[PDB]
């Protein structure tokens, strides 16, 4: 069993462990990073994003394809981020405001992008339109001042739990629960996927996952300088 370190991103502290809203599973901080936009050739910071994974399950699920790889190989491999997104384990995303945003701004930006992509790939069903209504519904009249958070729990059955906090505190319970795999994945893939808005969170995630898998490989590994066995 292992631990990871805490991360601080432009003043936002993401603890090494958390429990997502609506879940009993402990999660570890897999990666965190700034989300910004280049306007001018100035990098303007909008949010700090922490990506947490199910402590029980994620390493074991990822090791099979990713053990052996250096951080810079995971960081440049679209299939690694896609395995994180689509993994058979729970994920938890925490988006914490650096600049203020409103509920309508955030939800409009994400759902319009989702919808555009789904139409482009020919996979836009009534189920997705109804999931987008439900998502927009949860966000209308929320507003997010600096330090407030948006909280997403991503289930492996493809249920997205949305919740909000006024600060970095993560609440016990969930808010809306949207049973739609495409939107549940899209929300996280919008962050760490090929088109991901946080290259920083991606590089962090690659680096720390690579480290975790390497320490794990070396635990149960026979060395002559440590011969003192505990089996018969
Ligand atoms: O809505 C946002 C920004 C709008 C904006 C408005 C005026 C500007 O000058 C620049 C950006 C926004 C920013 C980051 C994000 O992750 C999700 C979002 O929805």
Numbering used by the authors: 0 to 231
Per the authors:
The structures of unliganded DaCHI1 and the isoliquiritigenin-complexed catalytically inactive S189A mutant were determined at 2.7 and 2.1 Å resolution, respectively. Isoliquiritigenin-complexed DaCHI1 was crystallized in the P3221 space group with a single molecule in the asymmetric unit. An electron density map of isoliquiritigenin was observed near the entrance to the substrate-binding cleft. Isoliquiritigenin was bound via hydrophobic interactions with Met36, Ile38, Phe45, and Leu100. The 4'-hydroxyl group of isoliquiritigenin also formed hydrogen bonds with Thr46 and Tyr105 mediated by two water molecules each. However, ligand binding caused an open/close movement around the strands of the β3–β4 region. However, isoliquiritigenin, which is a chalcone, exhibited a distinct mode of interaction, binding to the putative entrance of the hydrophobic binding pocket of DaCHI1. As such, we cannot rule out the possibility that crystal packing inhibits the deep binding of isoliquiritigenin in the DaCHI1 active site.
In plants, flavonoid biosynthesis begins with phenylpropanoid metabolism in which phenylalanine is transformed into p-coumaroyl-coenzyme (Co)A. Chalcone synthase (EC 2.3.1.74), the first enzyme responsible for generating the basic flavonoid skeleton, then catalyzes the condensation of three molecules of malonyl-CoA with one molecule of p-coumaroyl-CoA to form chalcone. Type I CHIs—which are found in most plants including barley, rape, petunia, Arabidopsis, and rice—isomerize naringenin chalcone (2',4',6',4-tetrahydroxychalcone) into 5-hydroxy-flavonoid; whereas type II CHIs, common in leguminous plants, utilize both naringenin chalcone and isoliquiritigenin (2',4',4-trihydroxychalcone) to synthesize 5-deoxy-flavonoid. The family of genes encoding CHI in Deschampsia antartica—one of the only two vascular plant to naturally colonize the Maritime Antarctic—was recently characterized at the molecular level.
